[PDB]
Amino acid sequence: SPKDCQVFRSDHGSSISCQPPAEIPGYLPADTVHLAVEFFNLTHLPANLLQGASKLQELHLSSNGLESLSPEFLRPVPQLRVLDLTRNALTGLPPGLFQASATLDTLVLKENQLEVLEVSWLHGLKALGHLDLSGNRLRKLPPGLLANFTLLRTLDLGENQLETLPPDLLRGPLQLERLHLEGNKLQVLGKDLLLPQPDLRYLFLNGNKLARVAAGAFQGLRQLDMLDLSNNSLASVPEGLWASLGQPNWDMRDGFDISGNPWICDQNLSDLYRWLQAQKDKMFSQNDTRCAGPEAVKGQTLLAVAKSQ
Ligand SMILES: *[C@@H]1O[C@H](CO)[C@@H](O)[C@H](O)[C@H]1NC(C)=O
Ligand SMILES: *[C@@H]1O[C@H](CO)[C@@H](O)[C@H](O)[C@H]1NC(C)=O
Ligand SMILES: *[C@@H]1O[C@H](CO)[C@@H](O)[C@H](O)[C@H]1NC(C)=O
Ligand SMILES: *[C@@H]1O[C@H](CO)[C@@H](O)[C@H](O)[C@H]1NC(C)=O
């Protein structure tokens, strides 16, 4: 039949995929463990779609044009581990949506149309490990957002319109691993934002409007594997900024990228020159890391000017 979904009876249980011309099932098999319902065109799903699905662990509801969710949608699946709502038209979440969702690990709200983030929309999440809010229209983040997510590993906020970051943004997770802030409108990075996460591994800050990094901003970073600062508006950086990054302290799994910045290569960059000389086999985009001035060295690479001392 062409109206039936695709079941894959397996050792855990079924995995079911529905896309047109298939029909959204009115009930789920009791042993459904993974459910994907995508490429439909509906303002909302049936509020009781998940009824009885007490083995469901992963719910992929990508690209359906959804504009709202029922407040009771997840009540039949307190054991849910992964909820993925990529590429829908959500502008908010109903209150209490997550009241019984204490074991949810991954929440993906990538590419909806959230313009604000209400702290109360996440009430009830506590085991959260992966929070993906990228590709929305957020300008501002409320205080206390992450304070309960002790187990948070990844925070993805890239490709929003964020103009500032609240100072307490990283204060709840015990050991954040990856922080995606690329493609926003951030302009400064303060002394304290990264203080709660000394063992952060991945920091993506590229494609912002970054003009100033406070001198102590990286003071406590002990094991950074990837630092992307590329594509910003940095003309200089203070002395000491890099003292704990890279060699000789840490062998970065990937490295760093400071390309696409209007570097001003005078003696205020000598500390960066020194640091760059010790890290060159970890330097991405070296050919695009060039001085914007002064006129004598305009257009030359940082490394060439660094090598020249
Ligand atoms: C979805 O449904 C509405 C009304 O039926 C329609 O205007 C819209 O073009 C449809 N298709 C897509 C891709 O959104
Ligand atoms: C964190 O936990 C308390 C409940 O003890 C709650 O009042 C507060 O709203 C929670 N914060 C978030 C973002 O859920
Ligand atoms: C950085 O990267 C690409 C080009 O490298 C481009 O989007 C733009 O010049 C910079 N990023 C932005 C504005 O988000
Ligand atoms: C970057 O390197 C490519 C080839 O490696 C070269 O075309 C270019 O001249 C370099 N610098 C530029 C475009 O400023």
Author numbering: 39 to 347
The publication says:
The serum glycoprotein leucine-rich ɑ-2-glycoprotein 1 (LRG1), primarily produced by hepatocytes and neutrophils, is a multifunctional protein that modulates various signaling cascades, mainly TGFβ signaling. LRG1, an LRR protein family member, comprises LRRNT, eight LRR repeats, and LRRCT.
The refined structure of LRG1 adopts a horseshoe-like solenoid structure that includes eight central LRR repeats (LRR1-LRR8) flanked by LRRNT and LRRCT domains. Similar to other typical LRR family members, each LRR repeat of LRG1 possesses a conserved LxxLxLxxNxL motif (where ‘x’ is any amino acid) composed of 24 amino acids. The LRRCT of LRG1 contains one disulfide bond that connects C303 and C329 (bottom); thus, LRG1 belongs to the CF2 class. The electron density map of the LRG1 crystal structure and OMIT maps for glycans calculated by PHENIX42 clearly showed that N-acetylglucosamines are attached to four asparagine residues: N79 on LRRNT, N186 on the convex surface of LRR repeats, N269 on the concave surface of LRR repeats, and N325 on LRRCT. However, O-linked glycosylation on T37 was not observed, because we could not build the three flexible residues (V36-L38) of LRG1. The structure prediction of the LRG1-cytochrome c complex using AlphaFold-multimer and the molecular docking of cytochrome c to LRG1 using Cluspro40 indicate that the conserved negatively charged residues in the concave surface of LRG1 (E76, E96, S100, D122, D194, E220, D266, S268, and D295) interact with the positively charged residues of cytochrome c (K9, K14, and K73).
